[PDB]
């Protein structure tokens, strides 16, 4: 029963379960323990929408990580076989690219549902009152608007490219293109979506790197762990692109 | 011309047309007749978005309703044939599962477009003014935020599971899995989406059951008729799951 989906799902469940407890600890448990604060309403959306993108971008990085390892070990020995653990990994690249897309659209829908919630309404009315209370016209903040317009726009075009990888995974559509075309989509356009995905997360952290309020006790913010693996994969893909 | 889609579409059109006139009567006709109020702007979205989910969740319940009837009539006679009306119904389960998904994504997009409308903007500005007018800081309501975060989160994961049922309906993808795998998705994961779909509607009616303002003249609110059939299907699936 689903022999080629056991390994990707177990890895997806481990990353999801480990990130969930990690994010739930920084956003709910830590405020509840010290300076008691409920914050229990953040679990259904504001916590799930921090597990889905990290699972989505990590599984996406695991698609091209073997492509980099397979190249350096080919040069490390000069010539021709792959270890068992690597060749088994190379086969499940199709499944990783699908789970990564399945969690990307969930992260997409959860994000588009932010202004729909009631918690967003009651915060708009409080901000509107607190602004009138202090006679502050023109609540506009220029550099903050720049941030939101960019990483939202990059996240959408980053998801559109993933949709091309997913639609070419249909066996009828997949068995309709020559290998040069299929390899052109899964590799050339595929790595672009990883690039737009990690920049979508870096621009989101405009200046949260230098801020110390992000670290609850000593743990880094959840986005620093998310973008760690894709950045490693991208720079090594660039090093290999140099004459070598 | 589409022989296997005549019966599902006629049933979908009957439920849609009957619910439309029923919802239009409670939301537009009743306020217009007594204590004249236009409310004509609610038709394009606020009325259509009450027909799509009821059509979506009813058609979804009609997928597993024969699976329950076929089991009780197998025990009612002890052994082996099905009546003509039932076996004809058993064949159109694939079409019902697709129309249910086609209206679920429409109900999804219509719902995500709520904060985009102008009627939502002009109500935010009125609420913000009426809050400043009465010097009420902290418009937050705890139990109302709990409601919105849950049923929105359940509706998204309930739609994601339907997407798995729809993607496995592609003939190239469908004719790529052994019967045990295909039956595992359409039945095990399929009934879960019905469970998450009806809870998505019950949590939406946090306390609207006891309220009498919902009943316009004597008709129940539209969600009570929607969740009626799925609740019947779910409890009978649970009764059959007991040793029997």
């Amino acid at each position: 029963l689903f022999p080629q989906w056991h390994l990707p799902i177990k890895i997806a469940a481990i990353i999801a379960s480990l990130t969930f407890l990690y994010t739930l600890l920084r956003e709910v448990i830590h405020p509840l323990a010290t300076s008691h604060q409920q914050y229990f309403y953040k679990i259904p959306i504001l916590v799930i929408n921090k597990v889905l993108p990290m699972v989505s971008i990590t599984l996406l990085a695991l698609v091209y990580l073997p492509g980099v390892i397979a190249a350096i070990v080919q040069l490390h020995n000069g010539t021709k076989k792959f270890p068992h653990w690597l060749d088994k990994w190379m086969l499940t690249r199709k499944q990783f690219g699908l789970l990564s897309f399945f969690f990307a659209v969930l992260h997409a829908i959860y994000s588009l549902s932010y202004p729909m919630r009631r918690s967003y309404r009651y915060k708009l009315l409080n901000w509107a009152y607190q602004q009138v209370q202090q006679n502050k016209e023109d609540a506009w903040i220029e550099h903050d608007v720049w941030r939101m317009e960019i990483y939202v726009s990059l996240g959408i075009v980053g998801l559109a490219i993933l949709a091309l990888l997913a639609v070419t995974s249909i066996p009828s559509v997949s068995d309709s293109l020559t290998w040069r075309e299929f390899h052109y989509i899964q590799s050339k356009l595929g790595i672009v979506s990883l690039l737009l995905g990690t920049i979508h997360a870096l621009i989101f952290a405009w200046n949260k790197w230098i801020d110390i309020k992000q670290f609850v006790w000593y743990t880094p913010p959840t986005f620093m762990i998310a973008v760690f693996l894709p950045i490693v994969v991208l720079i090594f893909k660039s090093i290999l692109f140099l004459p070598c | 011309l589409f022989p296997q889609w005549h019966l599902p579409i006629k049933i979908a059109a009957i439920i849609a047309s009957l619910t439309f006139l029923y919802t239009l009567l409670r939301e537009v006709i009743h306020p217009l007749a007594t204590s004249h109020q236009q409310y004509f702007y609610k038709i394009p979205i606020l009325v259509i978005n009450k027909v799509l989910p009821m059509v979506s969740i009813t058609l979804l319940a009609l997928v597993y309703l024969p699976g329950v009837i076929a089991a009780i009539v197998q025990l009612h006679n002890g052994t082996k044939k099905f009546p003509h009306w039932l076996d004809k119904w058993m064949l159109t389960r694939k079409q019902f599962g697709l129309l249910s998904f086609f209206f679920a994504v429409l109900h999804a997009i219509y719902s995500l477009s709520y904060p985009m409308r102008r009627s939502y903007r002009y109500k935010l500005l009125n609420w913000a003014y009426q809050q400043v007018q009465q010097n009420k800081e902290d418009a937050w309501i705890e139990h109302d935020v709990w409601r919105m975060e849950i049923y929105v989160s359940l509706g998204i994961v309930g739609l994601a599971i339907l997407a798995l049922l729809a993607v496995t309906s592609i003939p190239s993808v469908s004719d790529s899995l052994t019967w045990r795998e295909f039956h595992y998705i359409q039945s095990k994961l399929g009934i879960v989406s019905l469970l998450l779909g009806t809870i998505h509607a019950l949590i939406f009616a946090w306390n609207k059951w006891i309220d009498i303002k919902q009943f316009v003249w004597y008709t129940p609110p539209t969600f009570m008729i929607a969740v009626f059939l799925p609740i019947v299907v779910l409890i009978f699936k649970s009764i059959l799951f007991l040793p029997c």
Partner: antibody, heavy 121, light 113 residues
Framework: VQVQESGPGLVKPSQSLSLTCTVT?????????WNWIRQFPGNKLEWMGY???????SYNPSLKSRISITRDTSKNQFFLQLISVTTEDTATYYC?????????????????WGQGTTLTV | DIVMSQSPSSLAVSVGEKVTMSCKSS????????????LAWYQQKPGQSPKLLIY???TRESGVPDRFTGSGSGTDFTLTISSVKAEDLAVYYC?????????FGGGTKLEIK
């Protein structure tokens, strides 16, 4: 940051005064709102008004009419004008800063205060 | 205007002894959005400017001795000193910044005995 109040010490009743809150070592427009607090001889504090780093002001409604808080960003100064002073207006006037409003956790606190100046009518 | 009311107007204590000061509020100072109580505690030494001790009713200001601990939520807040020292002789005010205008308490004068 070193702040210092100034202004007259003795004024006649039914007159108009003007205090100063020359701020040194920091810019009055970056990330701090400055408030004006006065302390009556009976050890009773009262918040008169504040001025945001964008020129937005908000005064105590009990004396909103006869009050005005201006600034001179060219030299990091503030000005508190009491258009019609009275016997009740004699007190010690401090100008204390506070971290400006934030959408996440608003209204932090009035952390740093000045040494204040005494005013007599 | 939120009316702040401190229970002990002036209470005496000896060096090295626990003491508590109450600050009864008019309405709740708790923003239900982010559940933080907006109330601060100041300390005015004889002939000095009031310095901040505790903001948000529980967090000490950077540079405040550990013996100052504030607690409470809603409308009843308390400032506790574990061991009163000689330099803790001052007037302690509680203010609220829940909204405008800010209002201070009557002040609690601490007299060392």
């Amino acid at each position: 940051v070193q702040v210092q109040e100034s202004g007259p010490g003795l004024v006649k009743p039914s007159q108009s005064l003007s205090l100063t809150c020359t701020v040194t070592g920091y810019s009055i427009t970056s990330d701090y709102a400055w408030n004006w607090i006065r302390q009556f001889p009976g050890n009773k504090l009262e918040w008169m008004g504040y001025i945001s780093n964008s020129g937005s002001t908000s005064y105590n409604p009990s004396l909103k009419s006869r009050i005005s808080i201006t600034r001179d960003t060219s030299k990091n100064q503030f000005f508190l004008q009491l258009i019609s002073v009275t016997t009740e207006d004699t007190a010690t006037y401090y100008c204390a800063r506070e971290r400006n409003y934030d959408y996440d956790d608003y209204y932090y606190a009035m952390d740093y205060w000045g040494q204040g100046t005494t005013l007599t009518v | 205007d939120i009316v702040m009311s401190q229970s002990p107007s002036s209470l005496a204590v000896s060096v090295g002894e626990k003491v508590t000061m109450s600050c009864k509020s008019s309405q709740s100072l708790l923003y239900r959005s982010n559940q933080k109580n907006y109330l601060a505690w100041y300390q005015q030494k004889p002939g000095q400017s009031p310095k901040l001790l505790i903001y948000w009713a529980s967090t000490r200001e950077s540079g405040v001795p550990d013996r100052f601990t504030g607690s409470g939520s809603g409308t009843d807040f308390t400032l506790t000193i574990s061991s009163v020292k000689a330099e803790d002789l001052a007037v302690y005010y509680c203010q609220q910044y829940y909204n405008y205008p800010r209002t201070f308490g009557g002040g609690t004068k601490l007299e060392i005995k």
